[PDB]
Amino acid sequence: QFKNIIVTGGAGFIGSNFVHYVYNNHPDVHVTVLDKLTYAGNKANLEAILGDRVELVVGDIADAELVDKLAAKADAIVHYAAESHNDNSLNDPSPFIHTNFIGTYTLLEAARKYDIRFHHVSTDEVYGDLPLREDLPGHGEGPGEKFTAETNYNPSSPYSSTKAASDLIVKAWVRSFGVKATISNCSNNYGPYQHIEKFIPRQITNILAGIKPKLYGEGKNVRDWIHTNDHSTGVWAILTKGRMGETYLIGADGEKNNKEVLELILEKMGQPKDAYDHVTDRAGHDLRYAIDASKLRDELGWTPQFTDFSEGLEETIQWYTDNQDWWKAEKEAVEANYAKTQEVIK
Amino acid sequence: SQFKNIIVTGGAGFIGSNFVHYVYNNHPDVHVTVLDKLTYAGNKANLEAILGDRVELVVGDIADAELVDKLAAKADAIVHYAAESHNDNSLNDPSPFIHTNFIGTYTLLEAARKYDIRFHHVSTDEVYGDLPLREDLPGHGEGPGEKFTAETNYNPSSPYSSTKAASDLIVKAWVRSFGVKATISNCSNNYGPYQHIEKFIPRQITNILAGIKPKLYGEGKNVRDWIHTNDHSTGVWAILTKGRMGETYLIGADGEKNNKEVLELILEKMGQPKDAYDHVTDRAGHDLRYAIDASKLRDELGWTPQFTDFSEGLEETIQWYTDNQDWWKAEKEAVEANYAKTQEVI
Ligand SMILES: NC(=O)c1ccc[n+]([C@@H]2O[C@H](COP(=O)([O-])OP(=O)(O)OC[C@H]3O[C@@H](n4cnc5c(N)ncnc54)[C@H](O)[C@@H]3O)[C@@H](O)[C@H]2O)c1
Ligand SMILES: NC(=O)c1ccc[n+]([C@@H]2O[C@H](COP(=O)([O-])OP(=O)(O)OC[C@H]3O[C@@H](n4cnc5c(N)ncnc54)[C@H](O)[C@@H]3O)[C@@H](O)[C@H]2O)c1
Numbered sequence: 001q002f003k004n005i006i007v008t009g010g011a012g013f014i015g016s017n018f019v020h021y022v023y024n025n026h027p028d029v030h031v032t033v034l035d036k037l038t039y040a041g042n043k044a045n046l047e048a049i050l051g052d053r054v055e056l057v058v059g060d061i062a063d064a065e066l067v068d069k070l071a072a073k074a075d076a077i078v079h080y081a082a083e084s085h086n087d088n089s090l091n092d093p094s095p096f097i098h099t100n101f102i103g104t105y106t107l108l109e110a111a112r113k114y115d116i117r118f119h120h121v122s123t124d125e126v127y128g129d130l131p132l133r134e135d136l137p138g139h140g141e142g143p144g145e146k147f148t149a150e151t152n153y154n155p156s157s158p159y160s161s162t163k164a165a166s167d168l169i170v171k172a173w174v175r176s177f178g179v180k181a182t183i184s185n186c187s188n189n190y191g192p193y194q195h196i197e198k199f200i201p202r203q204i205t206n207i208l209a210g211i212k213p214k215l216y217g218e219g220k221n222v223r224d225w226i227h228t229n230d231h232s233t234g235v236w237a238i239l240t241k242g243r244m245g246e247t248y249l250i251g252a253d254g255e256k257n258n259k260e261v262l263e264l265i266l267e268k269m270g271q272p273k274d275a276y277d278h279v280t281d282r283a284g285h286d287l288r289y290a291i292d293a294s295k296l297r298d299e300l301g302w303t304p305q306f307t308d309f310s311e312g313l314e315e316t317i318q319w320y321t322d323n324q325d326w327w328k329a330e331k332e333a334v335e336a337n338y339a340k341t342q343e344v345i346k
Numbered sequence: 347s348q349f350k351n352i353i354v355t356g357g358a359g360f361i362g363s364n365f366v367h368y369v370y371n372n373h374p375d376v377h378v379t380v381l382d383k384l385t386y387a388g389n390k391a392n393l394e395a396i397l398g399d400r401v402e403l404v405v406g407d408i409a410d411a412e413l414v415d416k417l418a419a420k421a422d423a424i425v426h427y428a429a430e431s432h433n434d435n436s437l438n439d440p441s442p443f444i445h446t447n448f449i450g451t452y453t454l455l456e457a458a459r460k461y462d463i464r465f466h467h468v469s470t471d472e473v474y475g476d477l478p479l480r481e482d483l484p485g486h487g488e489g490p491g492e493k494f495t496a497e498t499n500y501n502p503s504s505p506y507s508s509t510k511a512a513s514d515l516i517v518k519a520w521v522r523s524f525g526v527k528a529t530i531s532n533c534s535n536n537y538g539p540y541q542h543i544e545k546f547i548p549r550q551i552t553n554i555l556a557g558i559k560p561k562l563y564g565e566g567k568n569v570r571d572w573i574h575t576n577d578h579s580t581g582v583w584a585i586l587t588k589g590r591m592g593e594t595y596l597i598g599a600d601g602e603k604n605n606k607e608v609l610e611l612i613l614e615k616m617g618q619p620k621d622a623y624d625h626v627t628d629r630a631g632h633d634l635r636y637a638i639d640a641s642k643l644r645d646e647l648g649w650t651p652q653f654t655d656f657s658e659g660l661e662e663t664i665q666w667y668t669d670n671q672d673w674w675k676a677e678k679e680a681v682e683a684n685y686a687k688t689q690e691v692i
């Protein structure tokens with residue numbers, strides 16, 4: 001149904017996985033990646049697949065003149081570009097305001113001008129926090145104990161705040177101006193090409209570099225893990241078959257606490273169970289996230305394929321091990337940045 | 347009276363100027379610095395009588411970080427009214443709404459964080475979206491979820507209401523993440539003296555005084571919950587001085603009416619025939635019914651509205667616009683010409 005799509009943020013983790021998906025499975029589609037190449041953008045994520053199907057344009061989603069030139073030639077925008085890290089947002093919120101809110105607005109106005117399709121990629125963090133399962137009457141399976149499409153927005157941080165704000169203007173542009181938009185809110189992704197500032201890759205690559213893994217407080221927090229490959233298929237389903245104006249939740253029923261994830265990484269890599277450091281906990285830290293993906297399953301027939309987390313994590317560890325040249329140049333700098341605000345608890 | 351040097355942003359507009367007069371007359375220990383950009387909606391005449399040693403007007407933008415810093419360094423609280431406030435202007439040109447409502451709120455929040463001072467965010471019932479009419483509700487407007495509460499989901503409809511909702515979300519995230527000392531109020535439709543003639547009630551009153559037909563959008567079945575600006579002022583004062591840090595309070599006076607009935611009352615009170623008006627082009631995405639349950643504010647802080655007789659409040663408002671024609675006569679032609687660009691008689 002689309003032949004010339006713009007993928008914003010396609011040189012990053014999840015966005016580049018999506019571009020690979022289209023290159024492999026839909027070779028009749030042309031992709032134009034629009035990416036600013038911040039600290040998180042990486043030409044190596046796309047270099048081997050650039051050609052007649054995929055092109056890279058370096059620039060800012062808030063650059064209205066550039067966005068206009070690109071949108072005049074496209075039939076859809078799939079929007080991943082964002083500042084994506086909670087810890088960076090606590091240290092300096094400025095680029096989150098610019099990219100996440102002003103950038104989304106700029107893209108919406110182009111979609112309105114050219115009357116083209118727009119899919120907004122977003123997060124479960126817009127809904128805030130939930131209690132741990134041991135503290136709920138239905139132990140996580142009762143009404144209201146997971147997020148649904150009817151859950152109230154209640155974000156906790158400058159990152160999650162600016163994401164939620166962007167979701168709200170998308171929805172208002174549909175009602176007020178008839179923009180052809182859909183929204184997705186997905187749980188925590190993992191897999192190859194994730195930046196080493198994030199939880200799973202940071203621990204794996206610390207171990208590879210002879211550095212201790214780092215756990216925030218005692219590791220009680222719970223995240224709902226989904227493989228990026230499954231997020232790609234979900235977005236493709238919503239883009240091509242979704243109902244205009246609707247919000248869809250994406251998740252794979254994969255809740256784990258941070259302590260248990262770290263213990264699995266240590267064991268898989270041959271390290272002792274206690275070979276890690278407890279570090280300064282995150283201001284305003286969100287407790288538990290959990291997604292009920294019944295609407296997407298029911299309506300569009302999407303099913304996740306990578307539901308064995310043990311096997312998915314094993315393949316992820318092997319990828320970081322086999323591609324050390326992809327991350328080694330960033331290790332010292334990322335760890336030094338964290339050292340400015342985190343220390344070992346003792 | 348815990349706060350002795352406050353900043354009131356947007357204090358040269360309708361509701362903000364009414365609040366500054368309330369402070370001058372009722373809290374003589376408070377010095378007020380107004381920060382106002384004087385857009386088409388700002389008017390020094392709304393403040394002139396009380397300008398002097400107790401109230402200063404500083405002309406500038408809430409998005410100018412350098413100016414905001416200089417003022418915040420001398421203050422012990424910020425009460426934030428500055429906004430682009432009109433749904434119709436937001437549909438014609440969303441640009442100033444993005445700049446003022448979102449970037450402006452962000453800039454003020456960063457100053458409150460820097461100086462560790464109290465911040466009260468003034469917002470609207472429109473952040474919650476729309477409700478059905480009472481005749482179409484199983485509880486006739488009296489059941490759970492048939493009026494807005496502090497637990498109601500955000501679901502804004504327009505560029506105006508979505509930028510306001512977005513600003514509310516960052517305020518709450520700055521509280522959880524950084525400990526900013528903020529409260530939020532969400533109020534229903536205000537009326538009274540000093541309201542800009544682009545708005546519903548003053549537009550009809552002044553059109554009649556000028557020899558022009560009033561204008562009703564579609565059949566006028568839409569419902570708004572009217573509160574006198576004087577009661578909004580006492581509500582904000584209560585929340586500023588006694589509210590629980592981080593909480594939202596709703597302000598309303600149980601005054602729901604449809605637009606047609608309000609227009610008919612104006613016509614009757616001004617000695618005009620009941621059919622002496624035009625139906626005109628309806629608003630894109632028009633919100634149907636708004637309604638506020640103000641229980642939380644009444645029960646926890648002891649506030650009660652004093653102007654509960656709408657007929658009498660409207661009578662006094664008509665008299666004000668009649669006695670102060672010099673305050674608005676020069677703006678009439680331009681406001682009506684702007685509306686003619688997008689509104690025709692139907
Ligand atoms: N990572 C997750 O678990 C997760 C889950 C659900 C949703 N999301 C959302 O998915 C999207 C991508 O997340 P990710 O983890 O790949 O992020 P990432 O940090 O790996 O990549 C972000 C990309 O955006 C680019 N970028 C930043 N600012 C830009 C700007 N102004 N103009 C153009 N490009 C810009 C960067 O160069 C980078 O390539 C984001 O919208 C995020 O909120 C992430
Ligand atoms: N009018 C209502 O029924 C209603 C109800 C609830 C809350 N609100 C909110 O109350 C507040 C005041 O509304 P109002 O009806 O008095 O609006 P208004 O249009 O009468 O006044 C807006 C004021 O803000 C100033 N301003 C605009 N942009 C600015 C900027 N960037 N920097 C500094 N000043 C700027 C204008 O000069 C003007 O004096 C708004 O935040 C609005 O969202 C309105």
Ligand SMILES: Cc1cn([C@H]2C[C@H](O)[C@@H](COP(=O)(O)OP(=O)(O)O[C@H]3OC[C@@H](O)[C@H](O)[C@H]3O)O2)c(=O)[nH]c1=O
Pocket residue numbers: 431432433434470471472534535536544545546547549561562563568569570605
């Ligand atoms: C100007 C105008 C309005 N209307 C209708 C539209 C609305 O249903 C109603 C009120 O219109 P507005 O004065 O534009 O107010 P509203 O859109 O309800 O928003 C107001 O209250 C909420 C506040 O947040 C907002 O700032 C304020 O402008 O009357 C008419 O029928 N005829 C008119 O000429």
